[PDB]
Design an enzyme around this catalytic site. Structure first.
Site, short mmCIF file in Angstrom:
data_model
loop_
_atom_site.label_atom_id
_atom_site.label_comp_id
_atom_site.label_asym_id
_atom_site.label_seq_id
_atom_site.Cartn_x
_atom_site.Cartn_y
_atom_site.Cartn_z
N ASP A 88 46.62 40.47 49.59
CA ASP A 88 46.54 40.28 47.98
C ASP A 88 45.24 40.45 47.53
O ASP A 88 45.16 41.20 46.28
CB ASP A 88 47.04 39.11 47.55
CG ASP A 88 48.71 39.09 47.91
OD1 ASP A 88 49.46 39.98 47.72
OD2 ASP A 88 49.03 37.71 48.23
N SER A 113 40.75 39.63 43.43
CA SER A 113 41.99 38.95 43.80
C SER A 113 43.41 39.27 42.78
O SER A 113 42.94 39.45 41.51
CB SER A 113 41.66 37.46 43.56
OG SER A 113 42.92 36.77 43.42
N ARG A 114 44.17 39.82 43.42
CA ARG A 114 45.36 40.16 42.45
C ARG A 114 46.23 39.23 41.91
O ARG A 114 47.15 39.39 41.31
CB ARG A 114 46.33 41.01 43.32
CG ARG A 114 45.88 42.44 43.96
CD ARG A 114 46.88 42.99 44.64
NE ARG A 114 46.52 44.31 45.29
CZ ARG A 114 45.35 44.61 46.12
NH1 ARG A 114 44.57 43.70 46.75
NH2 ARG A 114 44.97 46.07 46.27
N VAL A 115 45.89 37.79 42.14
CA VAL A 115 46.53 36.80 41.51
C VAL A 115 45.69 35.99 40.93
O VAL A 115 45.72 34.73 40.39
CB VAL A 115 47.10 36.00 42.60
CG1 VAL A 115 48.06 35.04 42.11
CG2 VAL A 115 48.17 36.66 43.48
#
Lengths: 126, 55, 57
Positions: A88, A113-115
């Protein structure tokens, strides 16, 4: 069982090298850099088992922190590319930043960070 | 007038030196590029033949 | 007394008192281009502001 687990794989590159050794010993034809064909499937299968379960499944979670070692900062390499395509996000540590005095040597431009945002306290998000 | 003449001469000399340094750097980089190209071709053909005869 | 902006930058970065400035000037300068500052430079000595002149180039 509803618990929360943190798993650290301190080197995936050495595991990939061991798998390449096993494949070559078993007379399986090699591919790029003598690596087997399913070197990407290996890591994808390993890393897809970390997840955040729903409330119907118990609500437990498992977070993973795989490690990849580069050579002279080369990111276009086979294993680093494959692992970056799966996770991710990535955190980049650079020797020039390390020796310039900034520690930890996190490269803000390359790390992502994809979150991000959803995984922060409200005050930190503000 | 003397200051302007000296400034122009200094600029000319500095630019000549910079051009020579850039040419030498170009030559060295071209040598390295050619070596890297040959190495890449060698690696690709070796992998091709190893995979082909691994059957 | 400084001609050229790099001298201004140097002396401003240092703790230096500079009274007369001139920055822009053609590539082939003429007498009338900065005769206006040469007159002030000589008039400062004639006025008693300072008692000595040195020029570096």
């Amino acid at each position: 069982k509803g618990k929360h687990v943190l798993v650290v794989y301190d080197d995936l590159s050495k595991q990939a090298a061991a798998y390449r050794e096993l494949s070559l010993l078993l007379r399986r034809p090699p591919g790029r850099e003598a690596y087997p064909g399913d070197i990407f499937y290996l890591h994808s299968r390993l890393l897809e088992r970390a997840a955040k379960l729903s409330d119907a499944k118990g609500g437990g979670s498992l977070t993973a922190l795989p490690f990849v070692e580069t050579q002279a900062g080369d990111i276009s390499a086979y294993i680093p590319t494959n692992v970056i395509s799966i996770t991710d996000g990535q955190i980049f540590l650079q020797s020039d930043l390390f020796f310039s005095g900034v520690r930890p040597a996190i490269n803000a431009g390359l790390s992502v960070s994809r979150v991000g945002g959803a995984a922060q306290i409200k005050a930190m998000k503000k | 007038l003397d200051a302007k003449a000296s400034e122009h001469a200094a600029r000319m000399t500095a630019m000549k030196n910079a051009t020579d340094n850039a040419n030498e750097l170009i030559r060295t980089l071209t040598l390295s590029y050619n070596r890297a190209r040959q190495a890449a071709i060698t690696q690709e053909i070796t992998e091709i033949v190893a995979g082909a005869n691994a059957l | 007394i400084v001609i050229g902006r790099v001298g201004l930058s140097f002396f401003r970065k240092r703790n230096m008192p500079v009274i007369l400035d001139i920055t822009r000037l053609p590539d082939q300068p003429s007498f009338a281009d900065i005769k206006e500052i040469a007159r002030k430079t000589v008039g400062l000595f004639a006025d008693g502001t300072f008692d000595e002149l040195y020029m570096y180039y």
